[PDB]
């Protein structure tokens, strides 16, 4: 079976850089109902089903934002899957989201460091997708792909052993979305662990 490594939020309202491993994710999603829990679920659900028709603006902060799922499939391959989110001009509504996938990323690279730049004198800065791309190109063996089709994002995820079922249409996504939701709401810890286990990183 696969291994869920972490959920990483970059520049979300309340979390400039926050990584949650399995235990912390489950604990956070199961506990108190406040803004933290709610912002974390949005990030989790948005990385899994990046479909603006199924779900955001006030949950993010101005500029580049990321929500990433760091994983290891049953083949023992590390796969990072995520989305770059952006509040558009003519705000308080428009949010642009682009899904991406990274293969072959060395363990020495953590998601937060991956997507940020902290120059000696400087303060942390989030890289836009174009800079991330160039940065990963430079790394031997790393394969990066952005998607314009949610269906393509999901196809790769299925091929890479990240998601147990194939999501071919918007209907498929609605159904999956409802499944995830039924398991993420309710404050029952074991239901969360159970859904991540049976819906993600199969075989």
From Swiss-Prot:
Q: Which domain of life is it from?
A: Bacteria
Q: Where in the cell is it found?
A: Cytoplasm, Nucleoid
Amino-acid positions noted as binding ATP in the UniProt annotation, renumbered to this chain? 31-38
Q: What is the effect of changing residue 30 to F?
A: In mukB106; no effect
| Subunit (UniProt) | Homodimerization via its hinge domain. Binds to DNA via its C-terminal region. Interacts, and probably forms a ternary complex, with MukE and MukF via its C-terminal region. The complex formation is stimulated by calcium or magnesium. Interacts with tubulin-related protein FtsZ. Identified in a complex with SpoT; IscS and ACP. Interacts with the ParC subunit of topoisomerase IV.
Q: Which family does it belong to?
A: Belongs to the SMC family. MukB subfamily.
Give the function comment from the record: Plays a central role in chromosome condensation, segregation and cell cycle progression. Functions as a homodimer, which is essential for chromosome partition. Involved in negative DNA supercoiling in vivo, and by this means organizes and compacts chromosomes. May achieve or facilitate chromosome segregation by condensation of DNA from both sides of a centrally located replisome during cell division. Stimulates both DNA relaxation and to a lesser extent decatenation activity of topoisomerase IV.
- What is written about domains in the entry's comments? The hinge domain, which separates the large intramolecular coiled coil regions, allows the homodimerization, forming a V-shaped homodimer. The N- and C-terminus together form the head domain.
Q: What is this protein called?
A: Chromosome partition protein MukB
Q: What is the scientific name of the source organism?
A: Escherichia coli (strain K12)
Which residues of the parent chain are present? 4 to 224 of 1486
């Amino acid at each position: 079976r696969g291994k869920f490594r972490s959920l990483t939020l970059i520049n979300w309202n309340g979390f400039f850089a926050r990584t949650f491993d399995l235990d912390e994710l489950v604990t956070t999603l199961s506990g108190g109902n406040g803004a933290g829990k709610s912002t974390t679920m949005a990030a989790f659900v948005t990385a899994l089903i990046p479909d603006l028709t199924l779900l955001l603006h006030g949950k993010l902060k101005a500029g580049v934002c990321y929500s990433m799922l760091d994983t290891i499939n049953s083949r023992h391959q590390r796969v990072v899957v995520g989305v770059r989110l952006q509040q558009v001009a003519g705000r308080d509504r428009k949010v642009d989201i682009k899904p991406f996938a990274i293969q072959g990323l060395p363990m020495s690279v953590q998601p937060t460091q991956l997507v940020t730049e902290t120059l000696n004198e400087r303060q942390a800065r989030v890289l836009p997708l174009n800079e991330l791309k160039d940065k990963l190109e430079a790394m031997e063996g790393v394969q990066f792909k952005q998607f314009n089709s949610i269906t393509d994002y999901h196809s790769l995820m299925f091929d890479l052993g990240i998601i147990a079922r194939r999501l071919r249409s918007a209907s498929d996504r609605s159904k999956f979305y409802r499944l995830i939701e039924a398991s993420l709401y309710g404050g029952i810890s074991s239901a969360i662990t159970r859904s991540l286990r049976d819906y993600l990183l199969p075989e």
